[PDB]
Amino acid sequence: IGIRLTLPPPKVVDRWNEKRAMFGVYDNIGILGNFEKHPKELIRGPIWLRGWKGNELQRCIRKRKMVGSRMFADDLHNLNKRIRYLYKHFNRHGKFR
Amino acid sequence: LRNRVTDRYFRIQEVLKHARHFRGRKNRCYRLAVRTVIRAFVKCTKARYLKKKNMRTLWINRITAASQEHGLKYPALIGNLVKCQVELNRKVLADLAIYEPKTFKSLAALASRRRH
Amino acid sequence: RQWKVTSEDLILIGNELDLACGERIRLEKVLLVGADNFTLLGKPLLGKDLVRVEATVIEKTESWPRIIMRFRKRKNFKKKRIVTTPQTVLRINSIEIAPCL
Amino acid sequence: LTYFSARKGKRKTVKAVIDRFLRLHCGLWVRRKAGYKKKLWKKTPARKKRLREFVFCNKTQSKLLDKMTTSFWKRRNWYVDDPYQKYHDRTNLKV
Amino acid sequence: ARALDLLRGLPRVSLANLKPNPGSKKPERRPRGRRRGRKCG
Amino acid sequence: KVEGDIWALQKDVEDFLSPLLGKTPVTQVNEVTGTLRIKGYFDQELKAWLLEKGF
Amino acid sequence: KFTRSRIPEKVFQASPEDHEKYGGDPQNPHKLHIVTRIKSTRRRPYWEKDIIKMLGLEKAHTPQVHKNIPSVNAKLKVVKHLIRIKPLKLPQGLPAEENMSNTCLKSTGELVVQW
Amino acid sequence: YRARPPPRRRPGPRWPDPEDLLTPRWQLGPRY
Amino acid sequence: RPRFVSLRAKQNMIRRLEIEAENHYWLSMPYMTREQERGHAAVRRREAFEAIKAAATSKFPPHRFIADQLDHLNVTKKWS
RNA sequence: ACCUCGGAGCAGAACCCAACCUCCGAGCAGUACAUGCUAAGACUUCACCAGUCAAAGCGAACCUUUGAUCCA
RNA sequence: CCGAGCCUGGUGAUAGCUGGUUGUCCAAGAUAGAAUCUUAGUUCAACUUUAAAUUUGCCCACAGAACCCAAAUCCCCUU
RNA sequence: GAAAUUGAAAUGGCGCAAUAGAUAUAGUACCGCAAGGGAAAGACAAGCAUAAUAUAGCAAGGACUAACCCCUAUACCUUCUGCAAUGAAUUAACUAGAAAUAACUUUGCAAGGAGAGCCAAAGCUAAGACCCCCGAAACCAGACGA
Ligand SMILES: [Mg+2]
Ligand SMILES: [Mg+2]
Ligand SMILES: [Mg+2]
Ligand SMILES: [Mg+2]
Ligand SMILES: [Mg+2]
Ligand SMILES: [Mg+2]
Ligand SMILES: [Mg+2]
Ligand SMILES: [Mg+2]
Ligand SMILES: [Mg+2]
Ligand SMILES: [Mg+2]
Ligand SMILES: [Mg+2]
Ligand SMILES: [Mg+2]
């Protein structure tokens, strides 16, 4: 019974809408534009992870460092608790030493 | 629930179809069905030895009956046929006993003659 | 194996024979030939001059799926395999004997 | 050790290792012998000579020390008059 | 080069034809199934 | 950085290196990347040989 | 303790009665053994298992030809309770290249060049 | 479609207004 | 519970003992002496180990072909 | 009562071992004050730590029982 | 529900302890010394797996291994 | 676990879709003296009935003309050295391997690599692969309670 008895409504995808059609444009902004701009400057997203990557602990540390003062109170409390938990887990748990 | 299983119906049915002829809830409930289906398949796999073993026992019983009809014992029949270089196997000898009694009579007479 | 055979009989070999369907064949290892009133016994084989048993490849099939399951309790040991064996159905067309005794 | 520090997210160096072992760049670790300064008056001259020596570590000891130090301690250092400059590299080594 | 002639022969290179170089992508091992589940290593 | 018949280069390298080794050297020809990988260290000999060939 | 067994050399000194019984001439001895494993190496010491592997007798009832020389014989002595040894008999001599593919090992221990 | 204009560095010097509270302190000193 | 030895078990043991006695006899007559056999197989043994060493030292990654890389484009081959 | 080390039983014949256990003695004493310094090659108490032996060379003369790191 | 109330928070406390740890198929895969506030754990060793390099490895015939006063073992040309 | 020093530009979803996503239809109902806790839900599965049962037994398998009768067959998981012990009425849904130091593999470039910093005596850069879930008695802080 864990199965739907009707076909789901058809999902139509426009492969040639503007977003898909122009996807990838300016990814070579650096090597084709005399390196005035780095391609990572094209990234739109959270201010604390534009052109940067890390595990959950590093992401949380960076978020606290960069926008911690602007965070809501309980969100910041949750982030502090999460950093503490992730520190304990990554530095004290695991199969490997 | 980013990724959820949608095939569980078919995964369950693959086992339930083999369980459909069981007794009780073993034919309906997957938790019980899967255990009995595994046992059924293991029995099926192991029974290919017993089929061969029982067929030879059946052939030997039938040959013993047919040869006792002619006063021979099965060891005498088999051994003397071997000594006469007749390489008929037990399946064929049982078939001859059932369906060609005169041929089996000839074989029994030959075995007794060889013995004598 | 040894097959007890007569004309028009069907025989199921549990392997492929490298023969096209409808192809005629001579079964060369005849151990026994018998009639209502007499039988001939090879020691262990009858001669080619005496008997001629001919068959025809009627079918080339696979067997029904056979399950091989292994299970050992309390060892997380469970394995399943499905095997289909090639098969050939032969029809025995004729048995001929010759007066070469 | 600390695999991810709470302030930088970086792996930390166990400074007990740095205070005790010298790493040759090729991957060898040199150390002093334990007790080389202890109660020398009751040790034979041969034992004292053995204790005064700089000694290499095992493969597994070296692997442990490599894990316990970060890549900074495993770099090429061109010190002016390093006594270990010649020992920093291996020569005529087959496998 | 003969490789470019082979390209001329072959279908168009698109985003549906791309494949990583063999040996550059190890399979991911995850703890499901008889061999990698249970006590999960 | 090999262009053209990497297999011809492999044959030439084997011919040039077998007298040195006493056996035909074992090699891998990456035709895709245009590289030739030879087991063993022969960098100096191969550099001199390619200089003689004029590359 | 259980250890390797040192068989006294008198065990392997045939008597004229043995010669008559088994039909082998001590002068001009047979060149090759046919050894078959007839007993399981399970429940036997690791050294017997190793000797069986070395002699290539892993499969039971599968004849293996070996030289009748002291080293091979020492190994065979180590595993003599697990094997059957019979001399290889060559009534027509060793096979020639022409009939190398037409040989057969008769159950009597004779390699016949016709089959 | 036509691509949006390529991203470019803002030409000339960028002088943040010191009155704004959100301008970073490093953008106000003599080093900047 | 005690166990007892049957006539069949005794006969089986006797058969095995007879086989072993024949093994003793056939092992009692070496063809060569220990001094004669010394080194008579050395050349073949050396060649066999040379083959083993060659196999051990010839291990290397297999070749890679532009044809193999480019054949993957056929996954989108259609009928026009 | 013992906990470390050494010697003997306790292992008949390379080593290892009867742990637990039995007896004994050492946390040394005597000697010398090159009884120094260096250095090939080895042993090893089944890991490591530690512990042994040592040619050649240099220099004087002309050996028989334990404890790491840190810290002072 | 007091040998020390209840609630919230620190808190996903900690647990060398208990329990659980989800597709298919193949393959390799075994008891073992030391130290340890340590014997319900761990680290090293041994074993184990994968990849790699190279050349010898196992078995062993003699010869050889103590005086005090057994079965076997070690070692290695051959094979 | 620093600092000197160095100096980043600027309306969307490879998110969930009613056990998910907020606890939320709602801090409501309900529970508590109180502080507090805190929901549910809206659009031929199991269980039965049609149709109780037939000697014998992990309930099946080999079969068979034939359901049973014949023959073979000491449930599963986990924990024990191994069988005893643990867990499981059953269905549906949910429910548990997160990552670095090196390595290895595949690219790039190569005595140099890397889009400053770093490494380099073939290295450097990039990617791929690998480190679970539930559970105490507790401790402390601040409230709430005679
Ligand atoms: Mg497994
Ligand atoms: Mg002692
Ligand atoms: Mg040692
Ligand atoms: Mg109360
Ligand atoms: Mg926990
Ligand atoms: Mg296996
Ligand atoms: Mg302690
Ligand atoms: Mg414990
Ligand atoms: Mg909800
Ligand atoms: Mg139903
Ligand atoms: Mg229960
Ligand atoms: Mg009152």
Short mmCIF file of C-alpha atoms in Angstrom, two decimals, chain F residues 25-47:
data_model
loop_
_atom_site.label_atom_id
_atom_site.label_comp_id
_atom_site.label_asym_id
_atom_site.label_seq_id
_atom_site.Cartn_x
_atom_site.Cartn_y
_atom_site.Cartn_z
CA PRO F 25 61.20 -2.83 -20.96
CA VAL F 26 57.64 -2.97 -19.71
CA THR F 27 55.65 0.09 -20.72
CA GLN F 28 52.20 1.62 -20.78
CA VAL F 29 51.04 3.63 -23.78
CA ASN F 30 48.47 6.24 -22.81
CA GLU F 31 47.19 7.01 -26.29
CA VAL F 32 44.56 9.39 -24.90
CA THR F 33 46.94 11.64 -22.97
CA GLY F 34 49.73 10.99 -25.47
CA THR F 35 52.21 9.70 -22.89
CA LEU F 36 54.54 6.73 -22.61
CA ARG F 37 55.34 5.28 -19.19
CA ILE F 38 58.36 2.99 -18.81
CA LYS F 39 59.08 0.93 -15.72
CA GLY F 40 62.42 1.92 -14.22
CA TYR F 41 64.43 5.14 -14.19
CA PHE F 42 65.75 6.04 -17.63
CA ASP F 43 65.26 9.80 -17.62
CA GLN F 44 68.84 10.73 -18.50
CA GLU F 45 69.22 8.09 -21.22
CA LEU F 46 65.86 8.95 -22.75
CA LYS F 47 66.61 12.67 -22.67
#
